[model samples]
Target chain A: MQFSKMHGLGNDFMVVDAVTQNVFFSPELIRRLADRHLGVGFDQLLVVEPPYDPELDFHYRIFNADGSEVAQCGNGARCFARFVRLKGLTNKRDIRVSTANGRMVLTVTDDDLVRVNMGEPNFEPSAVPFRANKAEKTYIMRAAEQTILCGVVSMGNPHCVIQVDDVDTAAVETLGPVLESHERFPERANIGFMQVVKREHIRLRVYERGAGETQACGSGACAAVAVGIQQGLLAEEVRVELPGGRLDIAWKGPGHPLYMTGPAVHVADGFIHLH
Target chain B: MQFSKMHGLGNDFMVVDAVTQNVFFSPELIRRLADRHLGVGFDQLLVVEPPYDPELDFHYRIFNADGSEVAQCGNGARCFARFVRLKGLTNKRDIRVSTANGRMVLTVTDDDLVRVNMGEPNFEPSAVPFRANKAEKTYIMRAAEQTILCGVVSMGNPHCVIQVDDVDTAAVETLGPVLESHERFPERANIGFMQVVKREHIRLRVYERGAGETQACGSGACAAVAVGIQQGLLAEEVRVELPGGRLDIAWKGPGHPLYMTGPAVHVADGFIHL
Candidate 1:
């Protein structure tokens, strides 16, 4: 099948169009295709299918390298919208798409930046699937024999945001896996370490659940902003700096939706022969 | 510059043709190009340069994804030979090339299998850069609070081969890193866990120094066979099965060169804008 390899701020993906082509992907196939040496390597696989709802432009499915399907992928969403638009699947600048979690809107700006309406941030313990008596601005969780205060939020997926004094010295590789598999989060969660540089700026590093520390994470940026704002430590809009690049995140308040804006880069395009 | 992405078994590489085109590569540039997300990802980068020696067809350079240049790469050698021939750089099937380690021979058979004369195995303490009073069939090393008996050999690079009953249940992720950085191996080593399936067959998994655990490790296969032969657990010729595919390795005996035969696959060829 034909595939276009694309990335948004270094979180790469393999974009497959299942709408115009007949293709079937098994867990084994996805794993092989994700192999860095044997097959085309990618952090996630984004497949485009005919939207289940007529109002939506496309149905996007996200698959991690280990072949587990995820409910949502913020970075993959941008690549999905850019792929469909560049392929002429949709001429409209703003497109509505359906995901496993729910429907989202993708806007393609004339400047080549893709903006995504990532839905409202959920802080309810049940929404995040975090075990707790009640929702709070932050909760203390023990990890690796250390106590950390984290703000749990779900942007269609679980995330635990921790504020660090310096992002560069954060023990991401050591503590990331611990917090991700912490007992409180039944579904496990993406771990984000944020260092607030100023009221309107922050440096973030995310150790994703399935994927490790990617250069950038779209949803994690939004989650960090939400946590920073909820704690009264930052403004509604913030520029989040990641290892890969920068992402602008904006949120109004508790009931408002999060908007993420970033650039998606087209690395290459080629057909992978499965047989 | 143009490049072809190829693999020996599943150990993939980006073969750059710098002979015909002028190219300059910096450590940062190579690391960027090797990034799976930002650039064409590869376990190692192979550059084809003009032969510094008069007798060789080309000069081969190997770099790990981290951008540190390594002396040798057996999997990369086969791909190097095939790349030169397919790119019309040379017509002669048997080609001689120079590397950071030394000169080696590469033969492209009519059947499309590339055979490499990987040079004689080195077991001297200084040659393997392993700190020891003397060389023996096996050395006991401590890793992760456990003791392991390994056969050390160097096929242009250091390797520690340990025998296990089953490779599937081996502690590769846990123990591989430990033994790789063991103090005895001053230069570090490629750690291999081998399961002797039979006298002539074995299953092996290698955790390379710079690249971690790869699907297939070419030189690692040769080193494992050499260690097995020296220890009398394997015959001169054996089938080394890696996670990616199988490789045929044969060594006559001590003081004799090892021969590795395997299929190198061309996955895709495209111009990666630098």
Candidate 2:
């Protein structure tokens, strides 16, 4: 099968165009392909398929390394946009695609960076699916016998943002899974430890719900900026520095779609023939 | 440039045909390509170069993940054979390749398994570069302040094999590195923990000198089997079970070439535009 390796910042993906080739990916096959040493290792796998909805340019699917399907991914979406165009799948600069989560628009610019309109951020307690009495800008959350003030936002995928004095030393390895699996987030959450350097800049490290700590998280960055605006700790636009690289996050506040701009790189082309 | 991703058991490598395409791999480039996440990941990188020696079919080079060049690699030799054949670099089934360590032979069988004559297993203390008084079948070596009865063997690369009751519960992660970097070895060593399951079978795990605990270690496996035969505990042919898979090691004794046989698998073909 033909596949392209791509990454946003340092978060990588294995993208296969199923639109041109008819095939099915068994969970076992997906698992094998995700093995870092034995296979074409990837944080996630992206499939580009023909859209059932005629209005959309393509239909996309996401899979974690464990082979489970996911509704949305930030870093993946940017790579998906660049991949389809790079493979000559489409000529449209502004690509409209439908994920399991619904409609999403991605625009590819001359600089080769992709800007994604990640719809709107939701903070309603019931909507975020977070167990709480009501929605607030910030809440006191329980994490491993300690109480932490964190903000919750859902950008298709849920994120729990905890502002810290120094993200470099954040106990992400210990606290990420603890807070993610807490009863508050029934479906679990991606945990982002944020360190605000200025009103316009912040550094973040995200522990994805199931993938653990990744180099960068797209939706996680958007979630941080979302909660930052709500908490009045950040400006309309903020430069988010992740371990992998930088992301330009812009949001006008409530009732607006968050725009995430970052570089999506093409790593290599691979052909696999398993015996 | 073109490359083939291959593995012996699960120990993988990125084989680049530097023979056909002239290119230089700087330390930075090798390090980047060896990255598990950011680049084409591998336990090591194998470069196939045209042999300067008229008698050899190809010149094979080995580089660790750290980008330092090594003298020899057993599993890498097998993959190097299949890679040259798969890429039409040679047609000889019995491929004679010259490494920095000298010439070795690899045979590809009808079953697709590769048999490598890993040269002679050396037990001399100075040859192994082990800091010791004399050569013995088993030597008491200090690993993290605890003494362990291990046999040191140099298969071009050095290996320190410690016998254990159960390899499954062995302190590989903790003791492997300790033994590997022991002051006794001077130039560090590959550490192997082994359990004699039966006269003909043994389980082993290896922590390489520079690379951490890998799925399999061909030279390490050979060293364990070599020491087992010398200690009169194992037969001539023993099936070595590593975390990655199995390897059949056979040695008649000190005067003979130790034969190591296992499968070398082709995983994928990749094109690098970066």
Candidate 3:
């Protein structure tokens, strides 16, 4: 199968065209293809298939390196938009897409940035599927012998946002796994450490659910901003800085959808024989 | 540049044809190429260059994923031999090669195993570049808050072999780094934990110096067998089982060289744009 190697703010993926080719991604084959040494390594494999819904342009599937399928990936969605356009599969600047969770819209901006209309943020415990009687601005969770104050939000995916004084000194590697696997989150969550630089800027690092610490995360940035806005700690429009680069996120208060803007890069194109 | 993705017991590499193309591997380029997600992703890269000596078929170079070039890689050498032959660069079954450390011979056995004549094991502290008053069968060391008895040997590369009762429960992730960077081994060392299954069979796991714990290590198997023989725990020929697969390792007493026999597999043939 021919694949395109691409990345959005350093979070890389292998974009496979399942629509144009006959491909079956078994768990074993996905694991082999995800091997960093023996196969074409990728943080996740994004398979593009013909849309099941008539209104949507494509159906995107995300798979982690361990071969487990995921519900949604924001960075991958942006790359999906760029890839479909660059491959001449579509001519529309604004594309509607469907994922395992729901549907989203991707727009290719005039400045070459891929802006995604991430659906409304879900704060209810049941929506996040968090073990709580009701939703609140923040919650204190116990992890790794330490108590952490965290804000929970779901952007078509679950995320736990923790405010830190300094992102550089945050115990991401040590504490990230704890929060992600915490019992409160029935479905493990992506953990993000947010250090609010000001009302409009913050430095963030995300320990993704299945992929560990990637260079950047699009949904993570959106979740962090939503949490910060709910806590009255930041402005609606925020510049989130990650290790790989920066992403601009804007969210209106409750009941409003979030918008994320970032760049997508095409790295390489190659053919990998599956048989 | 054109490349072949191959592996010897899961220790994979990107074998590049530096001889056929004008290639220069800078540290930056190597890092980008080794990025697991963004690049081709390899444990190490093997470059086939024109022979420095008239008698050698090729000069081999090895690079860790971190972009630092290393003196040698045994598993990479096996794949190197198979790659060159499968690519039709040469038809000779036996090929002479030179590395940064010294010259070695690679032969494709009749049964399709790549047999490597690893140079003689070095035990002299200075030769192994290990800090010791005198060479001994084993040295006691401290790592991960525990004392460990280990045998040190250098098969063109440094290695510290420790015997354990069970290989599956070995503290490779925690203690491997400590022992690898011990002060005694100035250049750092590959750490191997060996479980003696019998006089001729053993299970081994190696935490390589630059590449953490890989599925297998060719030199590590040889070093473990050499140490087993020196400590009187094994016979001359031993079957070293790694996480990926098994390898046949044979060594005579002191001055005799080591021989490693293992299979090399070509997983994919594709052009990754550099």
Candidate 4:
């Protein structure tokens, strides 16, 4: 298969042009492809298909290295926009694509940057598939015999945020597994560890519900900063720092929605046999 | 080069034995290796070498699919233990391995599962390299037009926590990106979204700093549960569910650290040329 390798702040993915090649994959096949020793290795496989919407040139689907399909990927969207333009799939600077989350708008910015409108975030419990007892800014939860303060949100997926005084000292390993599998989230959740730095800045660490701890999380940053603002703990705009690089996050308010802007770059492209 | 593919839960990895094979990778080359199309793809690449500890069989290093080396990978560690044993590298159920985070203990629970003692969590700011006015339980700060309450801790790598009303309505996209690059975190951090279900249950989602969103995050789940208990929101045990599946999490307390038990599965395997 013809492919282009790309990343957004080191959150890498492999872009596959399904339109150009005939590729078949089963769940097990997908899993095998994620194997480093045996197959082409990638955090997620971005499949570029013929656009479901005739108005757009392409549609993108994301599959985890383990071969599980996902609804949306913040970094992947950015890379997709760039790849489409770079591959001459479309010359339009602004592109609309469909995902499990809905139609996402992607824009190729100057300096090889790609910006995506992940649309508005949905905060309703049912939207996130969480059962609720009361309406509040923070939820009190427990895991591994400890009381924790957590905030939950969704960007087409489920996520939970916890506040800490020091990003440096938070026990990610001790608590990551607990929150990811907590009964509260039937669909499971991505776990965020955030340390508020100032009114407009904070540091975050994440134990992704599915992927574990990686260098950067674009959607996780947006979700975490949005919750902080609603709880009156942070300003709307914040600089979120991840191990790989940085992302700029901004939230208007309760219903204003969040915006994430960052860089997406291409790495390389190649193919390997499955057998 | 021959490699072993494995996963802890859904956090998959590619294992390469550096001692047995010569696998040279440049930054670009590493990126190519992680490409789903042009090369072998995986969430992270685990390189195994001669152990730093003479008593151990091998030492391992992990690099995210983005090609950045990471200090630790909870799921990767378990898969490492199983992969090494499957390769006949060790027969003992108890195994010691070294990583960028430090020495760790791994035990083969069953043919398909492995248990890892991730060590104790560090709450000191300096150790995690997170800059803070004081090492406290919570840190309150602001970002643009938002106010944020944060809790920081480290399980080898740094993590922060924030509390919100409901997991469904929390603002992960609006907040995660900003906090991940916040000035306070010099080394950057992972981003998590959490909700407390009852005193005994909590739900979580994470945007892994390097891998982005995944099916399951072993360490992220552990961290969320620990925060829930520390805040008096839940009991000692809780269920953490992810998009992929579910896991059982139980812990004693802060002083004793936390332990995570979950399922790890292996998919089919094959060889690929670079």
- The numbered model that scores best in TM-score is 2
lDDT of 2 by residue, B1-274 (tens): 7888888888789999998897678889989888876788888898999888888889888898999997765648888888888888898889988887778778987877889998789999898889988999889877657889988888888889889999989998899878888888889999988999999999998999888898888899999999899888899999999999999999999799999999888888988784
True contacts kept of each: 0.48, 0.73, 0.58, 0.08
Model 2: CA > 4 A from native: A73-75, A141-148, A164-187, A210-212, B73-75, B130-133, B138-150, B162-166, B169-191, B207-212
Give model 4's TM-score for chain A to 2 decimal places.
0.88
Model 1 DockQ class: acceptable
Evaluated on chain A only, model 2 obtains a TM-score of 0.90
Collision pairs in model 1: none
lDDT by candidate, in order shown: 0.87, 0.88, 0.86, 0.73
Winner by lDDT between candidate 4 and candidate 1: 1
Give a tens-digit lDDT track for model 4, residues A119-218: 5666777777667785457888978689998878888778788999987799888898888878888988889999998978889998887778877888
Model 3 earns a TM-score of 0.82
DockQ of each: 0.43, 0.70, 0.45, 0.05
Instruction: List the candidates ranked by DockQ, beginning with the highest.
Output: 2, 3, 1, 4
TM-score per model over all chains: 0.80, 0.90, 0.82, 0.51
